[PDB]
Write a protein that binds this ligand. Structure first.
Ligand SMILES: Cc1cc2nc3c(=O)[nH]c(=O)nc-3n(C[C@H](O)[C@H](O)[C@H](O)CO)c2cc1C
Ligand SMILES: Cc1cc2nc3c(=O)[nH]c(=O)nc-3n(C[C@H](O)[C@H](O)[C@H](O)CO)c2cc1C
Lengths: 168, 168
């Protein structure tokens, strides 16, 4: 039971960690911003268990990616922050009344939050990925948008294909 | 707490799943027997939490490997059985009185069990990896032995290098 939740959380983290390495920077946009579906399983986790289940996934994926894809000891962090802010608000919307109309709108406000909060913390995190400008933040945002959207599209498709033997 | 256990179990499963693909059949021995350290983290899991924590890891690693490295819908199973039999007895030895002397001997009896039980179930599982002879079982055993040993050596080294800031 508790163990059933734990087992699946683990599987989702495994797949996420994997997809962590299938990253591919965006044309015309900065390359420290890479983009992967290490976040889609984070979302299946959250719309199956808690948002806490979700956060566990975004978090474990990022830690592992840290040790290994090291040399970028911040990138991991930004990827977590986006993951969690977005998954949190998106759940903090699909949470309330009803479902599907709510899920999708939860994803739209989700990417909007994510982009805001991250363009903010990016004006106090782009600096430490010097350790390891405004025009830079307007290479940032365009990115965040597409991540929001695309993760949403992919998530949505798969979450759909759960109807299969979720029932039928 | 419960969540701390769950987090680390997840990390260990992620690393295991990964190491699942770094496999490399043994010279002079059959090639459906591949050999990987997808089992070492299973062991760190068990000598840190339950043997149940251990089994969760050997199990999640094998499931994922199933879906993906499919085409071998039995290999996954045999890898689980070895993993669990060995990790189980090895813990069912380091469990009792004292530690280190017990840990190592737990690994010795562990590989001896694993080899026995698997050469057994292999005389009623080599057949279904036709679906998907005695001389074959004496390409099997020599394998099982080296897996026991080598996993043990590797496990032992790493488990050691936990002294670092496990304390100092
Ligand atoms: C400086 C820096 C900024 C990042 N900003 C974002 C971001 O704003 N949104 C996002 O989804 N991922 C972001 N990432 C994550 C990036 O896609 C991923 O962590 C890669 O591992 C970086 O190589 C950022 C990474 C770095 C290093
Ligand atoms: C027919 C068959 C027998 C196997 N026997 C063993 C075994 O005896 N011991 C072991 O540790 N792994 C065994 N494996 C696991 C193998 O190393 C791994 O799971 C690969 O996925 C097989 O291609 C076996 C796999 C197959 C297909």
């Amino acid at each position: 039971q508790q163990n059933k939740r734990l087992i699946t959380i683990s599987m989702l983290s495994a797949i996420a960690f994997v997809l962590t390495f299938i990253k591919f920077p965006i044309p015309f946009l900065p390359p420290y911003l890479t983009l992967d579906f290490s976040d889609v399983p984070s979302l299946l986790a959250t719309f199956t268990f808690g948002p806490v289940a979700g956060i566990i996934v975004a978090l474990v994926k990022n830690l592992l990616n840290y040790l290994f894809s090291m040399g970028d000891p911040v990138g991991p962090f930004a990827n977590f922050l986006a993951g969690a802010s977005f998954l949190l608000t998106a759940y903090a919307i699909y949470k309330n009344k009803r479902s599907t109309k709510s899920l999708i709108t939860g994803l739209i406000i989700a990417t909007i939050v994510m982009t805001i909060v991250l363009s903010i913390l990016n004006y106090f995190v782009l600096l430490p990925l010097y350790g390891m400008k405004v025009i830079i933040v307007s290479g940032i945002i365009p990115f965040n948008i597409i991540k929001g959207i695309v993760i949403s599209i992919v998530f949505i498709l798969l979450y759909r294909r759960l109807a299969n033997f979720l029932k039928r």
